[PDB]
């Protein structure tokens, strides 16, 4: 039945900063397990994981791709383990993707560069992994590059991220003469062979060049491993050397509770270290049943609603972590079965939305390539064709299973752009493309603001957002150029008050009626009410008929609602009716509303009121070294500031900035802060601003 | 094999077959050489469920016509001896 | 291909080789008879006709050609040889 035992299943992710060697380390993994005949290089687009045309051309991973392998051992020590590795992206432009893959996986191998070590995206993946408490290990890649030092990278990890790291494999030699690595348990130096592409290696006697630091760190490894149970420490302090098996098990325990991360070193480009990192994935990373079960809520929660041991007998439960786009079926749902068994054709219940979905074609994955499989067992990552409504993060299960799983959080887009196709009448096709790309990606949203015709595109970055437009050009072909959003202004009176009026000679004999109103315009103040329309009834002279006395406020709405000046609504206008004229036969309301309109018009021209811009509450965090640069950038713009606050891990700056300015502020912020700042918009009250554009939007049309 | 088979006419969830002597290549409801009686499967009442045309069926089977399984069963049940 | 109609393809090619061999042998024997009839030596034409006749009857029986085709060959050749005198 089940091909591989549940213990011999690894669902692992490869997460780190941009270009740390993650996509290569995956190629060398697929090479040392024989599934790909050619090694392939990321720069020459040969990489199988980089299947999208953008990924080939720009040498970046714009998506998560899944693959499988069978790593027996370095000497075939263990039975073949089925490792499901989903390569992930490091660009801040695509963070949903890394968190998306990160949630389901049981372990993470965090790549690092020897030159740089801890980098901004490395802290980002660290915080994402820490919130989901995934057990982690680390690989220091690019040890061949100059400036390489294992020790410094270890110290950077300890000092910055916060973990206390235990070295597992040190490095023999400098950057160019990187022969191989020495393990701190078997006490063997696995020097790799240059002639062949890393497939073979030769074990040596760990020469005296590094025989004292090696012993020291080996001892530190022993001591760190002994902090798993009192039985380890008691024998350790007894003067006897612990056996390798208990050391490895105690380390596996410490990784399981996430106290420590095990750091291995190697260089994928130099075809070295990859076999040892995969070996340490088998030895130390957790299998699905090597942790306690996942929890959930049933019928608005319970004491212990679900503790589903991953097994082939319990009822089916899963999570759809990823949605992809297939032009030929219309969807591609990636799911991890946490506990249960499902098969082709089987129906499931989407617990959150309470509906029925049929699994048409469950398949397994090798990057873009798809291989049909009849059934999926528990703990396996697969893709489900035939799903047409399930959003990212929705639990898919058979009936009487946990309704809601913990995967209920997604980030907020920072960059907002507009887009408009060259031929304007491709709007329906573009809208369909945007709707699909927004349903698949929850961090990309498309809302068409109804003041204008523009389609608003929100994303995590300018890269993100332009990959979402050239991808449209290539697949589901449409040609569209991006631009800037338009302006949503409002108006406030510049402290002017009078008793203006309006009058038209509607009588003429035959017509039979006329209307006149005496109003009193005033503002209240900038931002005391949500309901800008204020009206306190006070009609004294010429009191109108008593069936529609309070009904002379809704008729004023059709002027305040939209468009008195340059097609922009108005806020804070107060009307106060004192006098007028009528005749109590049939005083026509619709032609009495003309007097009020001309009264508003006259009040507007005599008032000389000025335009009000949208200004929001941005809040930014940053390290206490770039405070000057960020505040200088806001000061260069017409931006106010609010809060002298310093956090413990940074500083929270609060600033009031316009909306027509600061277009693409996030990317500039990342540039001037080394990509280590975020922000948010709270849409606070509008503020006055001297603007040469405020009158140019109405003098474009003249009078 | 010129066959004598049921032709499956009628309505949804209530079949009513036509015993037709038709060449075995043509479809079930397709071209036939002759129709020899009907057969109502769902009849469980006084009116006759089935009716055959015994002399023409005998002529055909003497001319080498193949008899289907259900048509053989209806020839059986129609005869009093079986 | 896709299905197991490739077996019929191999059987068809082998049968084409065999049928082409045997049909060519038949046709060369009949060309021999025609050359004899066009030479005018009635005795060689009669011997050639009596040599081709069992060949064509055997193949007509096997099904490589039809009984009508064999009978047409024998009838035409007998008519030719009889008017040859």
């Amino acid at each position: 039945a089940r091909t591989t035992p549940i213990a011999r299943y690894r669902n692992i992710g490869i997460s780190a900063h941009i270009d740390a060697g993650k996509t290569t380390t995956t190629e060398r993994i697929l090479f040392y397990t024989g599934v790909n005949h050619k090694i392939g290089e990321v720069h020459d687009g040969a990489a199988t994981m980089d299947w999208m045309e953008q990924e080939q051309e720009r040498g970046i991973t714009i998506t998560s791709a899944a693959t499988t392998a069978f790593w027996s051992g370095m000497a075939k020590q263990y039975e073949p383990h089925r490792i499901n590795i989903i390569d992930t992206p490091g660009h801040v432009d695509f963070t949903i993707e890394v968190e998306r893959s990160m949630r389901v996986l049981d372990g993470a191998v965090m790549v690092y560069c020897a030159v740089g070590g801890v980098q901004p995206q490395s802290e980002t993946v660290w915080r994402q992994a820490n919130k989901y408490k995934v057990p982690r290990i680390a690989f220091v890649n690019k040890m061949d590059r100059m400036g390489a030092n294992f020790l410094k990278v270890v110290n950077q990890i300890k000092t910055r991220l916060g973990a206390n790291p235990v070295p597992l494999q040190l490095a023999i030699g400098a950057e160019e003469h990187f022969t191989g690595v020495v393990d701190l348990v078997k006490m063997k130096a696995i020097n790799w062979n240059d002639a062949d592409q890393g497939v073979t290696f030769e074990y040596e006697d760990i020469p005296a060049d590094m025989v004292e630091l090696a012993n020291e760190w080996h001892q530190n490894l022993i001591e760190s491993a002994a902090e798993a149970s009192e039985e380890l420490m008691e024998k350790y302090l007894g003067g006897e050397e612990l056996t390798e098996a208990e050391i490895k098990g105690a380390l596996r325990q410490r990784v399981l509770n996430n106290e420590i991360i095990l750091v291995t070193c190697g260089s994928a480009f130099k075809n070295k270290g990859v076999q040892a990192m995969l070996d340490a994935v088998i030895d130390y990373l957790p299998s699905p049943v090597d942790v306690p079960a996942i929890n959930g809520i049933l019928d608005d929660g319970k004491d212990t609603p679900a503790e589903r041991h991953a097994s082939d007998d319990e009822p089916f439960s899963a999570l759809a972590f990823k949605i992809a786009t297939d032009p030929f079926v219309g969807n591609l749902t990636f799911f991890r079965v946490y506990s249960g068994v499902v098969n082709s054709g089987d129906t499931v219940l989407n617990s959150v939305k309470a509906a029925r979905e049929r699994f048409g074609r469950i398949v397994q994955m090798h990057a873009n390539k798809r291989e049909e499989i009849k059934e999926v067992r528990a703990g396996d990552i697969a893709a489900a064709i035939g799903l047409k409504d399930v959003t990212t993060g929705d639990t898919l299960c058979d009936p009487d299973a946990p309704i809601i799983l913990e995967r209920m959080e997604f980030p907020e887009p920072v960059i907002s752009i507009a887009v408009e196709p060259k031929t304007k009448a491709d709007q329906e096709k573009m809208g369909l493309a945007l709707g699909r790309l927004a349903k698949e990606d929850p961090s990309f949203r498309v809302w068409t603001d109804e003041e204008s015709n523009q389609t608003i595109i929100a994303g995590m970055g300018e890269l993100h957002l332009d990959i979402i437009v050239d991808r449209m050009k290539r697949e589901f072909n449409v040609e569209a150029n991006v631009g800037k959003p338009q302006v949503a202004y409002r108006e406030t009176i510049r402290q002017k008050v009078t008793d203006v009026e309006g009058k038209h000679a509607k009588q003429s004999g035959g017509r039979g009626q006329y209307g006149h109103v005496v109003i009193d315009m005033y503002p209240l103040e900038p931002g005391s009410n949500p309901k800008g329309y204020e009206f306190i009834n006070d009609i004294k002279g010429g009191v109108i008929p008593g069936e529609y006395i309070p009904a002379v406020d809704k008729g004023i709405q059709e002027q305040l609602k939209a468009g008195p000046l340059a097609g922009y609504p108005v806020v804070d206008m107060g009307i106060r009716l004192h006098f007028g004229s009528y005749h109590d036969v049939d005083s026509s309301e619709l032609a009495f509303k003309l007097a009020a309109s001309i009264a508003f018009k006259e009040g507007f021209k005599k008032a000389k009121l000025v335009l009000l811009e949208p200004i929001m509450k941005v809040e930014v965090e940053t390290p206490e070294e770039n405070t000057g640069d960020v505040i200088g950038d806001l000061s260069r713009r017409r931006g106010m500031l609010k809060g002298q606050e310093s956090e413990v891990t940074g500083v929270k700056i609060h600033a009031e900035v316009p909306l027509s300015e600061m277009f693409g502020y996030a990317t500039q912020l990342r540039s001037l802060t080394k990509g280590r700042a975020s922000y948010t918009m709270e849409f606070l009250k509008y503020d006055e601003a001297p603007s040469n554009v405020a009158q140019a939007v109405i003098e474009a049309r003249g009078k | 094999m010129v066959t004598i088979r049921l032709a499956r006419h009628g309505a949804k969830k209530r079949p009513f077959y036509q015993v037709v002597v038709a060449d075995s290549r043509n479809a079930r409801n397709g071209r036939f050489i002759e129709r020899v009686g009907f057969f109502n499967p769902i009849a469980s009442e006084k009116e006759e469920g089935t009716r055959l045309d015994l002399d023409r069926i005998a002529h055909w089977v003497g001319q080498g016509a193949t008899i289907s399984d259900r048509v053989a069963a209806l020839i059986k049940e129609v005869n009093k001896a079986a | 291909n896709i299905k197991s109609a490739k077996k019929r393809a191999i059987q068809s090619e082998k049968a084409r080789k065999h049928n082409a061999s045997r049909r060519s042998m038949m046709r060369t024997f009949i060309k021999k008879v025609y050359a004899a009839i066009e030479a005018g030596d009635k005795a060689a034409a009669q011997k050639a006709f009596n040599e081709m006749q069992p060949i064509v009857d055997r193949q007509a029986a096997k099904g490589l050609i039809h009984k009508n085709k064999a009978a047409r060959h024998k009838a035409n050749l007998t008519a030719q040889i009889n008017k040859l005198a």
Binding site: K424, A425, Q427, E428 | - | -
Partner: protein
């Protein structure tokens, strides 16, 4: 072809896509088609309450 825009008030700009049906307006010589209101971004006649199946106006609650 030329085509009428029925109802009271429209929103037809220079590139808006619309559905065209048969008809005639008779007083306009050369207009033999009518714009189907309330279909394909040609919004329905505002504040309409009678003959509402035509002009593409959704049902008020009332």
């Amino acid at each position: 072809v030329t085509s009428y825009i029925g109802g009271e008030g429209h929103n037809l700009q220079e590139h808006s896509v619309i559905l065209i049906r048969g008809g005639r307006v008779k007083d306009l010589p050369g207009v033999r088609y009518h714009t189907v209101r309330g279909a394909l971004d040609c919004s329905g006649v505002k504040d309409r309450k009678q003959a509402r199946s035509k002009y593409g106006v959704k049902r008020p609650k009332a």
